[PDB]
Amino acid sequence: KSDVFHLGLTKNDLQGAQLAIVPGDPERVEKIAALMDKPVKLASHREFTSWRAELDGKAVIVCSTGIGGPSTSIAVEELAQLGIRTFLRIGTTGAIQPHINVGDVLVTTASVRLDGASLHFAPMEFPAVADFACTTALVEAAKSIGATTHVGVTASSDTFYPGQERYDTYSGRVVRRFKGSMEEWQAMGVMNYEMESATLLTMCASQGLRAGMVAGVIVNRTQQEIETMKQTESHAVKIVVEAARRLL
Amino acid sequence: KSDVFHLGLTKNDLQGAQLAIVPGDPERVEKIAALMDKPVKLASHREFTSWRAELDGKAVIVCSTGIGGPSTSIAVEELAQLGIRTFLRIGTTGAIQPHINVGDVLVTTASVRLDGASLHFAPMEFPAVADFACTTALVEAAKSIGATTHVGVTASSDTFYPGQERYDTYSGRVVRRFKGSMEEWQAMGVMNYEMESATLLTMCASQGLRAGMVAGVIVNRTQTESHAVKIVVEAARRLL
Amino acid sequence: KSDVFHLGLTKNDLQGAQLAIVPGDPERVEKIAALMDKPVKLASHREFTSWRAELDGKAVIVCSTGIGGPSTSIAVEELAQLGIRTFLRIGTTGAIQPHINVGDVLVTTASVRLDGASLHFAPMEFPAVADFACTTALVEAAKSIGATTHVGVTASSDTFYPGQERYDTYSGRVVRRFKGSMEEWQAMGVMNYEMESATLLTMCASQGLRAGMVAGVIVNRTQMKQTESHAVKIVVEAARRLL
Amino acid sequence: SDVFHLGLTKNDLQGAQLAIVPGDPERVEKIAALMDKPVKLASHREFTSWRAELDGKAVIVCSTGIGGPSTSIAVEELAQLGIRTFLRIGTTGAIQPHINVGDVLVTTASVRLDGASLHFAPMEFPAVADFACTTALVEAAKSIGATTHVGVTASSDTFYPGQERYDTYSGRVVRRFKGSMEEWQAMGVMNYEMESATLLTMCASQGLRAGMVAGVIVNRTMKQTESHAVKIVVEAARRLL
Amino acid sequence: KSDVFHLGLTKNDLQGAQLAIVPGDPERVEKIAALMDKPVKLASHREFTSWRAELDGKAVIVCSTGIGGPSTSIAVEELAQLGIRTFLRIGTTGAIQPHINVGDVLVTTASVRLDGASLHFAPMEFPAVADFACTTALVEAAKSIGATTHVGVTASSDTFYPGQERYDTYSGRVVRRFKGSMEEWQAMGVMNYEMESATLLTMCASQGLRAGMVAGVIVNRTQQESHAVKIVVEAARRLL
Amino acid sequence: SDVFHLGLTKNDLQGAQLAIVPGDPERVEKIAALMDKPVKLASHREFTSWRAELDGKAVIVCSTGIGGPSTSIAVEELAQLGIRTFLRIGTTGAIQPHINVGDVLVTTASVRLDGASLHFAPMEFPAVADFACTTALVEAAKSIGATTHVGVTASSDTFYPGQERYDTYSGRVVRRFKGSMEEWQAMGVMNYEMESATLLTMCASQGLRAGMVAGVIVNRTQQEIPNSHAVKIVVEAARRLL
Ligand SMILES: O=c1ccn2c(n1)O[C@H]1[C@H](O)[C@@H](CO)O[C@H]12
Ligand SMILES: O=c1ccn2c(n1)O[C@H]1[C@H](O)[C@@H](CO)O[C@H]12
Ligand SMILES: O=c1ccn2c(n1)O[C@H]1[C@H](O)[C@@H](CO)O[C@H]12
Ligand SMILES: [K+]
């Protein structure tokens, strides 16, 4: 039984859930669900692993998106079909501002659209903006947890390498568009790079769905040295769960 | 006399002000200022009328932007040069959603960039996004006075006519880009049209400046002013 | 009682006028109208100050546009609704060519579209070109009073600062698009920057309206009252030929 | 030869600084024959060049072939040889109902529906004709008494889909061009041709003077009109020497 | 225990492998590997499941890409870092031509770039073109195995839904860019939709890596709404 | 005439469904002369056309002139007349250091630095050659043992700035093309010419088969401008596609 093409889920599986937490990694799904009550694995197909748990007595979904806008768009669309109206992405990220430290938490108000999938939902002029209630819940939850928090703009790239201006690659070249791009984003106050939010935020904001994004800073592109990255993971994970409580 | 090319203001005129309320219309400037302590006229040059006031013992600027991104970009830049770090735009607006009514208050989280000036600060991929603290202050101020408030996306157009898909014009034509565009924005949940936010929000978000926007709905495309005005002043109070 | 949303004007106020002189600054409107017969103030709303005057017995309008394409597009549209078919922009301007000196007069044949409002009327492919009759009248008017005239392309920018590649700013930053752009326009023979012509010329050329532009060189970044009056006489003299 | 395509040297031009540039190589001699001392210089590919004399001054007539790409080659190489003024004389399909077959169209600027113009200036730059050239063409058309329209021309890299012709092998027009002719008509565009956007953009952005005149061969809504526009371009050339 | 960030693989793990077969689905990796000599599981991290096998005495990698250009670009880059120089994608696909049947095999010569990741390697002007030797090996392999084969252009979309003009979605809205797009690709002779080839082909063709693309038709859109695997393995034999 | 520019009727083709399309009008006769019963058909503007016979089948040779625009006219009108397969035979500037003058380059697909291709398909559509045509060209090349390279070609609307030549009147290259040759080179692009982007796009998007082959006349790593192997190959490839 499945109501959707990819996820292998039915509306019954959701038990009336209307909020989903959407990490990138299928392996993080169980870990996030473990922060809630009565978590049960629902399905695992391709990069889409899903669990249901209870939060303050209400059903909540945790479902992985895989890496990138394309797989993210599938998860979000199919979750929406199933009844999800609110999406919270939780990630781990590399900061590009020297003042943003490993262990810090980043809440994304909106994203630089360095992706392709967002364009499948809205023209480039449209902002990849987070829902206000979601952003509020994340900011507030970060205060409840105790994190050092930065709130602002994230660059959301379709690649891990040239789109984030990495030169440590097979070709060692970066196409003209992205040459000198990291310095530009830095100067514009962009906090970090990741790979899913442009798609998530655009597709939700343009379709009457609520979306927020929080991430833990595990590395800094400007710093030479590369605590536990699982400690920063757990901080961000606790925040997304606490935020979800306020959006139910 | 002036530390800036257009505004006719010095840093001294601001008296340490770091926040400016920025209406479009010079006429609205004094009225906004009058809701605060010790309001005084500063200068008037072209579409840039500026007043100073005080909230909770802190200096606040009110300065008009004129219509559109170009004049807004001038005002925001020169205010930034003089020490303004937080900008709160206040406008009146026409809603494009069936369930956004006249007398409603709109708080803009981000704008569709249907302008040219925003591109002079950041490429199109960059979001014309409002500052979270500003958006928070505006939403909370709106709730504190019991206004019917909608929070979300605004379409910000370089024109009043074709860019907002108006056909009641000299030519009666709308360029291909904008034909059917209102229905598209509507389907995407865009609240309203105005003409300055894409520029304001992009230029601030990409230059380490805080910006927010609130507007009063006075008409639907499918008393009010003084309520939006009360909201922007109360929001400013929370951001000093 | 107004027929249009912003200008506060009726068709009757124009008294059959079909040409408008469109300066940027409301404060310059009377000064221009004062060079013609029977100058009367019509209205003043926002940046749109309008006067009516009379030239060779025909009614003419002088109306300010404010700064930038957006406000210009409002003034032009609403003036067209009221019957205006010919628009003559007058400005004062800097220059980006070293051979162009303060005192010189610039007549614009077409503009580099560094604005956004022009795109609301025609796709970028469409030329921001001046009307031939208006340009002819302006060039001939400049010759009649013996002004040193440069005829060519103007870069029309939605910003005063980064789009004209100014670095003396709060951020000191210019976006990639405009980094090295002034040198590029200079090498392409562009005369100057201003902020309204791309919108004016495109919206008129694509809607059967006639537009032209003249400007006095007051400053040169590469390198004012006398130049002002020169440009104003030219635009008024050109208007006579176009009535 | 001093140049790669045209097969010409600086001396072949004998001090010439103006070139009349038709599209068709076969039209070159005809135009040259209207002036004094017409002499064939060279013929390579679509580039046939003649020299002639106008009021004692050497003038070049050189074909461009069809399209911006070959036009850009001819213009560049002539510029290398010393040409500073270029006058295009062409054939055109009018798209305005009031413009009759046989009429003369003087182009102030072009809608850039080409690719070559972008190799000289970004799309924001106007494909605008030189004022002196345009003035000379208009004044020449008046002296000949020709029915003349002055304005904007759509300049297309294709004869078929870019001019929204459906009478084709596929009968398909790509989205960009579907409904485009009506759009250009509403915007007051006079006509279609295939070289002006490149010519005007490359000249205006490089300090070269260019003008564009054409005779109407079809209305998108016979023998005498060619010579009519040809007479105009030669008369205009006289005013630009 | 890993020379690359995401795959969890070391250069040692590859055993001299220079060719990788790259399916979308992690769960298909073992199946493909099983068709060859000495299949050994290497790693499984995120959507990246990798096996090593042997084909005519030579080491060959099978590694999943996950869905979409972004995850594909990571797999290809890190596999290239470990020494892979030839990539053969084996996928599933929806045909958009009436004459192409379910169960048919499609060899892609080049792709319509309806993706974003390809632009991170080459501007849009650059063709998302397959390697000639890889395409030849696939066509030749198809003759060998015996399948109804179509060779041509593929539309490669960053989405499963709006980019493939699907309307049975939550919003039922397809953005302007993609309204009527399927009929357009159909008239242009495009065979099919999938989601990875534009990224794969562009990133390889612009980086001196060889890439080929083959897929089995699982649905025909003009109605709704193992051959291919044998062919990719046989093609790999011809390319070692 | 059945078509506006070429001056040809379907009868002139004698059932030909394949055309060999050089850029230069003066090359048409030379190509035709390598086949049986060569007959001149017409010469209008840059479009010179001949008919010939290959293995008892009629073949057209027709010049395109330089550039996408005139190419698009020739291909379209030939298509109207019944041509379904087009083989471009051109000259080219190599941008890779180890490609020799005289080498034969077979194009798999083109970088669309042209304008005409966009009149047939949006930029995301690949300017890709037909597989059968490309195969025939490669296999003809090995049959005569010519030094051959197969891969991507940059196809430009200009000879000068779009191919980043600086020895020009202005000596300037617009921002878009500054540093472009190094970029294409790094991307493994073999060569520059001016027609293939248009040809390949317009054919691949309209159910017409196209192949592209060119002889190297200059190596751009060394010089901008120079101080019948490819022709044999295109004729031999044509035999295989009849
Ligand atoms: O609709 C038309 C009519 C005439 N011309 C045209 N388009 O382009 C010009 C060409 O060079 C050429 C192509 O036929 O002739 C010009
Ligand atoms: O219409 C289709 C049919 C199959 N596939 C597709 N689009 O994209 C490929 C994906 O990786 C994936 C997504 O379902 O499967 C492939
Ligand atoms: O650098 C080059 C060398 C040869 N060719 C070229 N560029 O474009 C092709 C043209 O049609 C024409 C222009 O010279 O010949 C081809
Ligand atoms: K994925």
Ligand SMILES: [K+]
């Ligand atoms: K203004």
Ligand SMILES: [K+]
């Ligand atoms: K040509």
